[PDB]
Design an enzyme around this catalytic site. Structure first.
Site, PDB file in Angstrom:
ATOM      1  N   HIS A   1      37.521 -13.159 -35.776  1.00  0.00           N
ATOM      2  CA  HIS A   1      37.837 -14.591 -35.678  1.00  0.00           C
ATOM      3  C   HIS A   1      37.188 -15.272 -36.855  1.00  0.00           C
ATOM      4  CE1 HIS A   1      38.646 -14.266 -31.092  1.00  0.00           C
ATOM      5  NE2 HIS A   1      39.742 -13.956 -31.821  1.00  0.00           N
TER       6      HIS A   1
ATOM      7  N   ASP B   1      39.732  -6.309 -37.876  1.00  0.00           N
ATOM      8  CA  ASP B   1      39.661  -5.619 -36.576  1.00  0.00           C
ATOM      9  C   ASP B   1      39.393  -4.148 -36.865  1.00  0.00           C
ATOM     10  OD1 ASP B   1      40.449  -4.261 -34.204  1.00  0.00           O
ATOM     11  OD2 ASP B   1      41.736  -5.949 -33.610  1.00  0.00           O
TER      12      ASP B   1
ATOM     13  N   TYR C   1      34.670   2.755 -21.153  1.00  0.00           N
ATOM     14  CA  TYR C   1      33.521   2.503 -22.042  1.00  0.00           C
ATOM     15  C   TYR C   1      32.661   3.759 -22.151  1.00  0.00           C
ATOM     16  CZ  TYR C   1      29.868  -0.500 -24.111  1.00  0.00           C
ATOM     17  OH  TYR C   1      28.956  -1.107 -24.927  1.00  0.00           O
TER      18      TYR C   1
ATOM     19  N   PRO D   1      24.878 -14.407 -25.866  1.00  0.00           N
ATOM     20  CA  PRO D   1      25.699 -15.443 -25.246  1.00  0.00           C
ATOM     21  C   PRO D   1      26.730 -14.883 -24.264  1.00  0.00           C
ATOM     22  CG  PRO D   1      25.178 -16.063 -27.470  1.00  0.00           C
ATOM     23  CD  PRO D   1      24.625 -14.663 -27.291  1.00  0.00           C
ATOM     24  N   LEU D   2      27.358 -13.757 -24.540  1.00  0.00           N
ATOM     25  CA  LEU D   2      28.357 -13.181 -23.611  1.00  0.00           C
ATOM     26  C   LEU D   2      27.713 -12.771 -22.294  1.00  0.00           C
ATOM     27  CD1 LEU D   2      30.566 -11.046 -25.973  1.00  0.00           C
ATOM     28  CD2 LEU D   2      31.156 -13.238 -24.913  1.00  0.00           C
TER      29      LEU D   2
HETATM   30 CL    CL Z   1      27.528 -12.853 -28.198  1.00  0.00          CL
END
Ligand code: CL
Ligand code: CL
Ligand code: CL
Ligand code: CL
Ligand code: CL
Ligand code: CL
Ligand code: CL
Ligand code: CL
Ligand code: MG
Ligand code: MG
Ligand code: MG
Ligand code: MG
Ligand code: MG
Ligand code: MG
Lengths: 250, 250, 250, 250
Positions: free
Chosen positions: A38, A61, A154, A192-193
């Site tokens: 992004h 990407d 994962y 943050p996530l």
């Molecule tokens: Cl993050």
């Protein structure tokens, strides 16, 4: 400066662990290209660390094979020959093996497994035989060592990265390529996530998960990556470096 | 009979390790469907073991997702509910990570990784909660533990199978599904395909490779699979069973 | 200075790996006490690094339990509270398990296993709950991961150190002691003792032993120990740090 | 009979896991000598399995070096040459590393580590080069893989057994001794001693400990030992066989 003269690509370098790796790499004298999907995020991330004489953002990407040779070219035009590749881009899916859709499976593997393969393969080709003290740092996780019932795809990706990296390390060592390959295995790291998911940090901090009773921070992963990028680790290859608050020790 | 009442699917069951697994499973009282890509080979393989009241061949490529639900249906129509899945189908590529083409990468992962995922996912769905003493046996290898510089994509696949299997084992255990999941890790095993490659057995038998100074035979893998399919191993899940002549011990 | 304010005991610090650890610890701002069995060697070793405001030698055999509390007292009188213990003292015996005498067994375990136990146990007691950022670094080796047919008792000792260290790490983490415990696992490292054994370095450098085709040097182990002693590694506990030229990757 | 012609010594064979190993060994055609410290218990244990043409008890403490050659002699006089040694005798101490007294340390290591060493060393000497298909099965545990903060000395012992066994396996393989050496790693197993400790089984059965949500039973360990004693496992050496309800998979 512990990374004097190094030129690093850090995939997924615009957030979290990758951002901290890039920050400490610049602090230790490396020139860095960070990638991410992004543009607004990546532009802000690069400027937060430094000016374009030390750090640049490239939109890429890691699952995009064709963009890999252009990423090396862009980095080399800016800073000279790449010495260090940190394959950190990755995504997660919260599904058991049972509940994983094939779409989820293929999407996660495209970033977490193909992206690491593309960066490792091309890093070897572009860095071998140049006396660079080259280092490829592949981001596995605790989920490369132990299962999690809710992280099936994962786990597959992180186990693959773990063992594929040993193959690459051996080939590079046996052929005297002057390229090392190692894996880093974070436990839970506050980002943050994580903060965005109500209750996540507290679950991760239970003693039955992380014995230290808290989770880590991005710089915990940055500092082991500095060691692995630096010539201090010139005899370390094919190995796994676990920074997890004790998660895997029990 | 150690596998009384068991009904097994053995992928790649027409050759080598898979054929021996099927043979010993029948010997111990299981009913078996073997799969393979080639009809003439598979028909001959099934008949070499027994009649159609105990063993049948189904032509199926483990990379073929849609064929998996039809394989379970065919097996269940023949023999009743499936209890045991041996994800043994696999291919190898003799390339370093550096030298692996993307075509080679994707093809090998389609069988060795996707096939195991498809069989594990569907085995859980089709076998859970039925009191079957169900067992999924995923064929990893020594290349799930250690690198080989000439087997990069194979190493990725086998590491993925190793850790993905732990995720599945945990989910099944935590949810009381009555499904166990374990990995088997052969070292070098003498087969017609090894015999076809001049010098291969001798290289594999060097003491720096296999400490026993010789390679194994398919029944070495069949017998550990009998243990894992049987109710004798009802407390074993999420574990790795290595039969390698000492390869990984040094 | 990466070890600002740290106060370290380095056992077996007068030779080889331990000497290099002490050297780099002083370089990074730590105060250090090195131990060894032989006074002339130890006096020369300490002076080669620095003056007594930064490094001192104490004659001590790590197998000597009573001398451990006196070693902490001597170090604390010199430099203030100990923050860092490197359990590096060790001996080797060149015998298979079969050929090991009980005398050899007990002697090797007295240094390599009891010494690490004594230093770990006392380090926890003396360093816990003091906000020191305390770190115990237990020297295992590649022989903590893989067998060597000629190093039976050594393998026992190094496996014991590996897993005992995880117990200690967990207890310290769970009790919020502010003490981390980790293991370091050298591969082959060039030292005067290796140089004294005709043919040893060449055997160790064969690609079937060390894939890099050469052995390491003491500073390779010093730099990972700096990382582990420093607050950079505050989320690393219970883990194994392998610096081996690829030995264990194949 | 899967153990036709085998002659086994099972140390600590009068209780729990060792008793079940002896029971299933006799069931599969082996002749067995069980050892233990207490005569009344051992006499009752042997008679519970069979008559003296198949099983006998010998009073022996595995820490007693001199008694080992007399134990082999007694077994050979009864049943002919020993083929199989199961080093199962062991004790536990419920102490952290920090809280372990030196007396506790030395006592636990005398049984759990020295006893395994004595049985392994003497088993190699007495069984090599006789075409017996000889097998040494060393009882490690999950505490050979992961720490437990309350089992410090036990962890040391089990890690030592794990890696020492690989050394022995390699030496035997390289020298064509016809002796295999492997480790078995039980998770939690229900025994009278567990039953005697109020609350123990429930703690062990929590999903954060054993994912299956219950503990095992002695026959779970007996059946993997039958496999390892039998010629079915003739290509398995230097490996670790984990039967733990998923404990180590998470
Ligand atoms: Cl993050
Ligand atoms: Cl290119
Ligand atoms: Cl074949
Ligand atoms: Cl279906
Ligand atoms: Cl030296
Ligand atoms: Cl004290
Ligand atoms: Cl008992
Ligand atoms: Cl004797
Ligand atoms: Mg559901
Ligand atoms: Mg665990
Ligand atoms: Mg080439
Ligand atoms: Mg190896
Ligand atoms: Mg000899
Ligand atoms: Mg206390």
């Amino acid at each position: 400066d512990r990374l004097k003269g190094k030129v690093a690509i850090v995939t997924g370098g615009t957030l979290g662990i990758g951002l901290a790796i890039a920050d400490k790499f610049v602090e230790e004298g490396a020139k860095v290209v960070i990638t991410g999907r992004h543009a607004d995020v990546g532009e802000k991330a690069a400027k937060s660390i430094g000016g374009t004489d030390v750090i640049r953002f490239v939109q890429h990407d890691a699952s995009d094979e064709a963009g890999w040779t252009k990423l090396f070219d862009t980095t080399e035009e800016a800073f000279g020959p790449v010495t260090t590749v940190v394959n950190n881009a990755g995504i997660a899916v919260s599904k058991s093996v049972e509940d994983t859709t094939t779409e989820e499976w293929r999407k996660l593997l495209s970033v977490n497994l193909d992206g690491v393969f593309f960066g490792t393969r091309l890093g070897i080709k572009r860095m071998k035989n140049k006396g660079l003290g080259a280092s490829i740092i592949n981001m596995s996780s605790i989920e490369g060592f132990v299962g999690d019932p809710t992280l099936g795809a994962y786990n597959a990706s992180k186990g693959a990265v773990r063992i594929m990296s040993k193959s690459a390390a051996l080939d590079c060592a046996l052929k005297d390529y002057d390229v090392r390959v190692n894996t880093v295995h974070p436990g839970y790291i506050k980002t943050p996530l994580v903060d965005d998911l109500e209750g996540a940090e507290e679950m991760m901090s239970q003693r039955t998960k992380t014995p230290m009773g808290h989770i880590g921070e991005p710089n915990d992963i940055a500092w082991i990556c500095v060691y692995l990028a630096s010539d201090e680790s010139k005899f370390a290859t094919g190995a796994e470096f676990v920074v997890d608050g004790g998660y895997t020790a029990q």
